[PDB]
C-alpha cells in the first residue's frame, strides 16, 4: 500500500498545504493527480527518482513538490487558493507501467481551503439507546450515533465495544447532511447506526462508545477568538447495556 | 485521445446482470493498455482488471471485459450483481509516450446494488438520549430497498437519507434512515410522513 498523510487538511486563505505520500518500497514512478468534485481525475506531476518527468502548466495553480532519496514525497502549494480545495491522490509504479498496470494508488488527501477559519467548529456526539418497542418487536437494538454542528466535513465515525472497536453490525451514512441546506456553509450532521443482539444490549456489563475524530486546526495556528480553538480532536458519546 | 463510459448513477438490484458501457478514442497510438479501476466506498483507488493486449479478455471479481478492436470499447460486465460490488468504477487506458506512461481515465459510473430484503418489517422507532434529553431520534429501519426516504422541507428537522447495515454473524442486512429534531410538537409518527411509506408501517407507541 501507498500512504498519504494527511487524511484530512483545513486551511486559511494564502496559508501553505504540505501533503505527504510514501510510495511502495522499490517503486521510482510517483504521480500527483487531483481528483474535483465530479469524480474527475487531473494530472498534476510525476517523479521518476528524484527527477520530474511532466507537471502540468502552472498558469492557474502554483507548487511544489519533491521526491527526494530516503525521504517521502511531498506536495506543496503555497498561496492556498479556494479553487484548489480537492482530493489529491499520490500514486507509485516500478517504472515498468504496464501503463497504469503497476500504478498503485494512495487514499487521498482532501484538503478544503477556507476565507474564514472562525467557520471551522468541532462535533457534538450523542449517543442514542435502542427503542423497548425495538427489542420487544424484532429482538434487536439498534443504537444510533449523532455527530451534529462539525465544519468542514472532515470527520471519521467509528463504534467501541468493551473498549474494541468493532465492525459487524455499523453502518455510517455515506455522506453528511447540511444542518442549513439552504446556506453556503452551513455545519454538518453525521448519524451511524451499531445493531447488536437484544440480550446483549440487555447485559449492563456491555460499554458501546462512539468515536468521533474532528480534523481542523493545527497548535502551530492563529486563534484569538471567544471559543476553544477548533483543533484536531477526538469527541465521544458513550452509553452501557441496560437490563 | 480520449474515453467515455455510462454516465449514471447506476442503481440495480442485488443477483441483477450488470454491463458499464466503455468507449475509447485513441489517436496516439493505434493499441493502447485497458483498464478499469474501482474505488469502494471509503476505500483507495484500484485495480479491477487489466488487457495489454487488444482482442483478449481479461476477468476479476465475476467481471469481465473485452479489449474489443472493432467497435473501440471496453465494456464491463457481471451476471449476479452483489451489493459489495457497490463503488464507482472508472475505466482507464494507458498509452506509454515519451518513455514515461501516461493514463486517460473516464468520468466514472457509480454503481449501486440494492439488497433484497427478504422478510421486511418498516418499523419507526423513537430513542432516547444515554445522558441528556435534549432532542429525541428516530429510526426508520427494515424496510424494503424500493422505498427511498425524502429529505427534510423544514429547516429545524434533520433526516439522513438510508443506510444499508450488515450483521455479519447471520446474513441479516436491513436499511434504516435516522430523523431527529429540537421543533416542539415533532413527533416519531410524523418525521418520515413527507416520504412515501410502506402502508403496513409499524408505528408503536413510545
Known amino acids: 500500500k501507498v500512504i498519504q498523510t494527511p487524511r484530512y487538511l483545513v486551511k486559511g486563505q494564502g496559508q501553505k498545504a504540505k501533503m505527504r505520500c510514501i510510495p511502495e518500497?522499490?517503486?521510482?514512478?510517483v504521480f500527483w493527480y487531483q481528483q474535483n468534485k465530479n469524480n474527475e481525475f487531473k494530472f498534476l506531476i510525476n517523479?521518476?527518482?528524484?527527477?520530474?518527468?511532466?507537471q502540468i502548466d502552472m498558469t492557474e495553480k502554483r507548487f511544489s513538490a519533491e521526491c527526494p532519496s530516503n525521504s517521502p514525497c511531498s506536495l506543496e502549494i503555497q498561496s492556498s487558493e479556494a479553487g484548489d480545495s480537492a482530493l489529491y491522490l499520490c500514486?507509485?509504479?516500478?517504472?515498468?507501467?504496464?501503463?497504469?498496470?503497476?500504478?498503485?494508488f494512495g487514499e487521498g488527501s482532501k484538503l478544503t481551503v477556507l476565507e474564514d477559519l472562525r467557520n471551522v467548529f468541532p462535533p457534538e456526539v450523542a449517543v442514542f439507546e435502542p427503542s423497548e418497542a425495538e427489542i420487544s418487536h424484532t429482538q434487536k437494538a439498534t443504537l444510533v450515533c449523532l455527530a451534529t454542528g462539525f465544519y468542514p466535513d472532515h470527520v471519521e465515525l467509528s463504534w467501541w465495544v468493551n473498549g474494541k472497536e468493532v465492525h459487524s453490525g455499523v453502518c455510517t451514512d455515506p455522506q453528511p447532511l447540511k444542518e442549513q441546506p439552504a446556506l453556503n456553509d452551513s455545519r454538518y450532521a453525521l448519524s451511524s447506526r451499531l445493531r447488536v443482539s437484544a440480550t446483549f444490549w440487555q447485559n449492563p456489563r456491555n460499554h458501546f462508545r462512539c468515536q468521533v475524530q474532528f480534523y481542523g486546526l493545527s497548535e502551530n495556528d492563529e486563534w484569538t477568538q471567544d471559543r476553544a480553538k477548533p483543533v484536531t480532536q477526538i469527541v465521544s458519546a458513550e452509553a452501557w447495556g441496560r437490563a | 485521445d480520449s474515453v467515455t463510459q455510462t454516465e449514471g448513477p447506476v442503481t440495480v438490484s442485488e443477483s441483477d446482470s450488470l454491463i458499464i458501457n466503455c468507449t475509447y478514442s485513441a489517436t496516439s497510438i493505434a493499441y493502447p493498455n485497458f483498464f478499469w479501476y474501482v474505488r469502494y466506498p471509503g476505500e483507495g483507488l484500484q485495480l479491477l482488471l487489466k488487457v495489454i493486449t487488444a482482442g483478449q479478455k481479461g476477468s476479476s471479481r465475476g467481471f469481465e471485459a473485452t479489449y474489443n478492436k472493432e467497435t473501440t470499447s471496453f465494456h464491463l460486465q457481471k451476471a449476479s450483481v452483489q451489493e459489495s460490488d457497490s463503488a464507482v468504477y472508472y475505466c482507464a487506458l494507458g498509452i506509454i509516450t515519451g518513455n514515461t506512461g501516461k493514463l486517460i481515465f473516464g468520468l466514472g459510473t457509480t454503481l449501486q446494488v440494492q439488497p433484497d430484503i427478504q422478510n421486511p418489517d418498516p418499523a419507526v422507532y423513537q430513542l432516547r438520549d444515554s445522558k441528556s434529553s435534549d432532542k429525541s431520534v428516530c429510526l426508520f429501519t427494515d424496510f424494503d430497498s424500493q422505498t427511498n426516504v425524502s429529505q427534510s422541507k423544514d429547516s429545524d428537522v434533520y433526516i439522513t437519507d438510508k443506510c444499508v447495515l450488515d450483521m455479519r454473524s447471520m446474513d441479516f442486512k436491513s436499511n434504516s434512515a435516522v430523523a431527529w429534531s429540537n421543533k416542539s410538537d415533532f413527533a416519531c409518527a410524523n418525521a418520515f410522513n413527507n416520504s412515501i411509506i410502506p402502508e403496513d408501517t409499524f408505528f408503536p407507541s413510545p
Open positions: 500514486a507509485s509504479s516500478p517504472g515498468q507501467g504496464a501503463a497504469t498496470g503497476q500504478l498503485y
Open positions: 518500497k522499490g517503486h521510482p514512478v
Open positions: 517523479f521518476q527518482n528524484q527527477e520530474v518527468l511532466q
